[PDB]
Symmetry: C4
Subunit: 91 residues, 4 copies
C-alpha cells in the first residue's frame, strides 16, 4: 500500500519520541530526555554504541521493543528501495 510506508513511519517516529519518556524515570544511566532520545535512535537504528545501556527489567523490555522496531525499520526502508528500483527495469 502507498499509505503503508507512512503508517509504519508515523508509529515508528512516535515510539522514538514517546518511549524515551518512561526511560528517564525508570533507568539510572538515563537522567534526561535528550540523553534518552539519543539512546532511542542508537537502538532503533540497530547501531548500539553501548554508551547508554538499560539495567532495569522494564527498561530492558522497552529496549527489546525498540530493537524489534529497529530491524523492522531497516526492512521497511529496504522494501521502499528494492521495489522502487526494480519496476524501472522493463519500462
Amino acid at each position: 500500500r502507498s499509505n503503508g510506508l507512512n503508517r509504519f513511519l508515523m508509529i515508528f517516529v512516535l515510539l522514538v519520541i514517546i518511549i524515551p519518556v518512561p526511560m528517564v524515570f525508570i533507568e539510572p544511566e538515563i537522567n534526561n530526555y535528550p540523553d534518552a532520545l539519543w539512546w532511542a535512535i542508537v537502538t532503533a537504528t540497530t547501531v548500539g554504541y553501548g554508551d547508554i545501556v538499560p539495567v532495569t527489567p522494564i527498561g530492558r523490555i522497552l529496549a527489546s521493543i525498540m530493537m524489534l522496531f529497529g530491524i523492522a525499520f531497516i526492512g521497511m526502508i529496504t522494501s521502499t528501495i528494492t521495489n522502487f528500483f526494480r519496476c524501472k527495469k522493463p519500462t
Copy 2:
C-alpha cells in the same frame, strides 16, 4: 512457503530462550537467566551494546551462532515485507 516464516520464527525464538541457559554456567559476565536472555536479544537483533560480552570459547562459539541467526532474522523479516508490499503494485 506460507509456513516457511513460521518454521524459521519458531526455531529462532526457541534459540533466544534455550541458548541463554548454558551461557549462565559457562560465562563469568553472565550470572543469571534474565541477564542471559537480554544478551541473546541484543546479539540476535545485531545491536550489540557490549555491556555483556562472551569470554570463553564455547560462549564465543554459541554467540557466533546467535549472530548468524541474527542476520538471518533480518533477512527473514525484510523478505516478509519486500515480497508483501510488491504484489500490490499490479493489482
Copy 3:
C-alpha cells in the same frame, strides 16, 4: 535508474569525508580527522563499536544523520544485489 546507485553512493561517500571535519572541533572524544573518519565508517556501516561516542547535541545530531544514511546504505546495497540476482532466473 542506472545512475541512481551512483547518485546515492557519491553523496554517501561525500558525507563520510565531510561530516568528520566539524566533529573534530565540536567533540572532546574526537581529537583528529583519522579518528573522526574511523568513527564515521563505524557509524555509517551500523557497526557501532562505542570506542568513540558523540556527547554534544550537534555531534549527536550529525551522528543521527550518519545512522539514517547508514541504514539507507544497506538498503541501497541489498537492492543492488536482490534486483541483480533475480533477473537471471527466467533467462
Copy 4:
C-alpha cells in the same frame, strides 16, 4: 547465478579466516588468533560489541574492509531469501 552465492561466500569466509592473522601482530588489543577470529565475526556480522577495537591505521583500514564485506554479507543473505520465497507465489 547459482554459483554466485558460493563465489561470494568462499571469499567472505576466507577473509574472516585470513584477515585475523595480520591483526595479531599489528594490534596491541589483539594478542592471539582465537581473539582475532572472534573480532572478525563480531565485525563481519555488523554486531560490533566494542570489546576488541582496532587502534592502528592499518588495523582500522582492515576493519573497514571487514565492515564493507559485513554489510555485503547481509545483502547476499537477504537476496538468497527474498528471491527464494517470492518464486513460490505464482506456482
